[PDB]
């Protein structure tokens, strides 16, 4: 279980293109 964590970072750690949703309580 690593290819999933290395592929997720491409979106979870890509605020440059991603809207970035840390689910912070408004």
From Swiss-Prot:
Residues covered by region (Interaction with calmodulin): 1-12
Subcellular location(s) of the protein: Endoplasmic reticulum membrane
Modified residue annotations for Phosphoserine: 26
Function summary: This magnesium-dependent enzyme catalyzes the hydrolysis of ATP coupled with the translocation of calcium from the cytosol into the endoplasmic reticulum.
Protein family according to the UniProt entry: Belongs to the cation transport ATPase (P-type) (TC 3.A.3) family. Type IIB subfamily.
Domain notes from UniProt: The N-terminus contains an autoinhibitory calmodulin-binding domain, which binds calmodulin in a calcium-dependent fashion.
Name the UniProt record assigns to this protein: Calcium-transporting ATPase 2, plasma membrane-type
Organism: Arabidopsis thaliana
Organism placement in taxonomy: Eukaryota, Viridiplantae, Streptophyta, Embryophyta, Tracheophyta
Gene: ACA2
